[PDB]
Amino acid sequence: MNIFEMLRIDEGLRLKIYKDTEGYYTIGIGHLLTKSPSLNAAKSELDKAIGRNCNGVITKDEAEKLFNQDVDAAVRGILRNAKLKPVYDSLDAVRSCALINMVFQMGETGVAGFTNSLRMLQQKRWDEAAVNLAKSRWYNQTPNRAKRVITTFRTGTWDAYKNL
Numbered sequence: 001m002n003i004f005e006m007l008r009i010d011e012g013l014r015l016k017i018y019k020d021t022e023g024y025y026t027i028g029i030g031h032l033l034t035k036s037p038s039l040n041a042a043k044s045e046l047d048k049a050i051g052r053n054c055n056g057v058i059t060k061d062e063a064e065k066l067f068n069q070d071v072d073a074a075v076r077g078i079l080r081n082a083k084l085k086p087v088y089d090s091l092d093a094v095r096s097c098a099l100i101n102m103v104f105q106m107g108e109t110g111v112a113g114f115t116n117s118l119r120m121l122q123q124k125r126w127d128e129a130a131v132n133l134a135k136s137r138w139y140n141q142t143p144n145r146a147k148r149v150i151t152t153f154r155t156g157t158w159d160a161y162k163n164l
């Protein structure tokens with residue numbers, strides 16, 4: 001398993017503009033277009049992103065292109081962030097993907113705000129971080145995904161994604 005497969009599983013793939021779990025216009029593999037309640041604004045954002053007149057629909061190759069850009073951005077964001085980088089640097093390859101996953105879903109500021117959890121991951125107190133991570137709006141709003149990610153941080157294995 002790798003970060004792309006993991007996220008492809010958590011985000012799914014849609015070629016037409018849709019509303020994510022929070023009600024925001026999104027497309028492709030979890031690519032947020034805008035937070036504005038305007039479909040019109042969303043379509044304009046889509047066009048700008050792809051570079052052509054899409055009329056709200058895209059091809060799979062285009063979805064995958066946005067996806068590569070989005071993973072790249074998440075990783076680079078983590079590395080530029082003073083709170084996130086040290087954690088990411090301390091984690092093994094498998095657990096690092098869980099951190100990337102959270103950043104992809106909530107953004108760098110969202111994640112950097114999980115200070116207590118971050119401190120526990122850094123200290124390698126897996127079980128404790130797991131409990132702390134679960135005491136969040138994130139867990140209560142998207143429990144199945146949060147469970148998969150948290151299990152990944154706890155065990156350092158892909159078991160939660162395995163056989164899905």
Ligand SMILES: [Cl-]
Pocket residue numbers: 135136137138140
């Ligand atoms: Cl809560």
Ligand SMILES: [Cl-]
Pocket residue numbers: 141142143144145146
């Ligand atoms: Cl969920």
Ligand SMILES: [K+]
Pocket residue numbers: 088089090091092093096
């Ligand atoms: K790492």
